Symmetry: C2
Subunit: 259 residues, 2 copies
């Protein structure tokens, strides 16, 4: 079980840090978390293969987290019956984006996909596919629960609504948070408790905390405080402004979680 | 006056050849022809600056020619006259909806002028630009410095070539989208004695049948068109990915056009 960082930069892809994308691998099955522009080329450079991706999870509808998605699907198709659809989980709006973009570009994908949309709430920002609704008691979204994994989402605060994802082996726990300046109620501490790996943004340095919060971002001290509060075993910082063990992510870094 | 190749590959971007994008530069003013995924990052790696781009021309709505556009506009905005965008019907709504979905407020104004294709181009505020039946071309603009026109190509979906004429008469640069041929005589006439002619050669001549099946050309097809137009120099691009003067385009190649 490992995470491969494809893009570790904030706001846009650069020559030194790609736009947001991380792949979680379990037993040859790949799950992609975020898909900024250039993700498909970062995949090509990596040891991973786009064709092995079975699920995709989008944290929020800022372009550095999803503009690479149409390209990625097209290329997977161009290079390919798959039996099971690729499952795509993300905020409301994502399903129509993909459908329209594929139609506009006259792309007939050779595989089936389904988009499951998470419904955000207005307090996340300043004042056949499923629709997935918050459970107010649990304070989370159930994405899926099978024999191997339970995967859930929780609400973050950002300039637009943003989500974190919790992956639990039925075992190891990996939590991956979208851009944020905070978490809505106890959703994070609950789901992220004793995470084996916690992936958190740290867009700006601690001296720029005011600017960070302004833009719905975090600094390393904010991430670290959340990690300590959740008793995470490992904290990995990512989504750096372009130019408990704590690791600063770089593109193509692979972190394994031993059993 | 120079031409800079940003991406020279076919169908998708790779680590060795980016998706379609070429920049024409005159006296510090940059015009971009096509905008595949990764174009913004190629620009960063190049000696060019995204912020100097004043016009963008899209040959056809295949993703390897436009999926990079939303990202490019966002990054130009983040890092900074209106930008003029020319391309097929459908492009304007694509850009508008994508900006809205991603909650992007661009700091510059842009306008999208749409070219209306004809049905025989494929197998059986902003302007809406019609084919002129007398001239068999589309007038994009005509000022004291330049006359720029589009003409119809045959591809799997409708595709366009662009003719740029400097007034002295002066230099003529013609850049053709993906195609297996030109539709009627509008194109041969506009490309006559081109100083530089940029043409695809997706597959080698031994795969001509496969090339034509996919609305593509081989080097002999491109060469024959260059000879027919009496072009001075032919540059081949849009090469299949590793999965009369004739020059083979590579990413970051710069060709200077003397007066
Ligand atoms: Na790879
Ligand atoms: Zn971001
Ligand atoms: Zn964001
Ligand atoms: Zn193409
Ligand atoms: Zn094409």
């Amino acid at each position: 079980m490992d995470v491969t960082f494809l893009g570790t930069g904030a706001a846009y892809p650069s020559p030194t840090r790609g736009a947001s994308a991380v792949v979680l691998r379990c037993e040859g099955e790949c799950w992609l978390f975020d898909c900024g522009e250039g993700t498909q080329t970062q995949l090509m450079k990596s040891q991973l293969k786009a064709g092995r991706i079975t699920k995709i999870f989008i944290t929020h509808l800022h372009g550095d987290h999803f503009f690479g998605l149409p390209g990625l699907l097209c290329t997977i198709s161009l290079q390919s019956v798959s039996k099971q659809p690729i499952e795509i989980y993300g905020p409301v709006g994502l399903r129509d984006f993909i459908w329209r973009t594929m139609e506009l570009s006259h792309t007939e994908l050779v595989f089936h996909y389904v988009v499951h949309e998470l419904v955000p709430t207005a307090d996340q920002c300043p004042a056949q596919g499923r629709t997935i609704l918050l459970d107010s008691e649990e304070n989370s979204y159930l994405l899926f629960d099978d024999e191997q994994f339970v995967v859930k989402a929780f609400r973050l605060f950002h300039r637009i609504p943003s989500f974190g994802f919790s992956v639990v082996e039925k075992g190891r726990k990996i939590c991956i948070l979208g851009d944020c300046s905070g978490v809505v109620g106890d959703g994070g501490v609950k789901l992220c408790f004793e995470a084996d790996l916690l992936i958190h943004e740290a867009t700006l340095d601690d001296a720029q905390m005011d600017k960070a919060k302004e833009h719905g971002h975090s600094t390393p001290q904010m991430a670290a405080t959340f990690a300590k509060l959740c008793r995470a075993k490992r904290l990995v910082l990512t989504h750096f402004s372009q130019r408990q063990e704590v690791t600063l992510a770089e593109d193509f870094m692979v972190i394994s979680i031993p059993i």
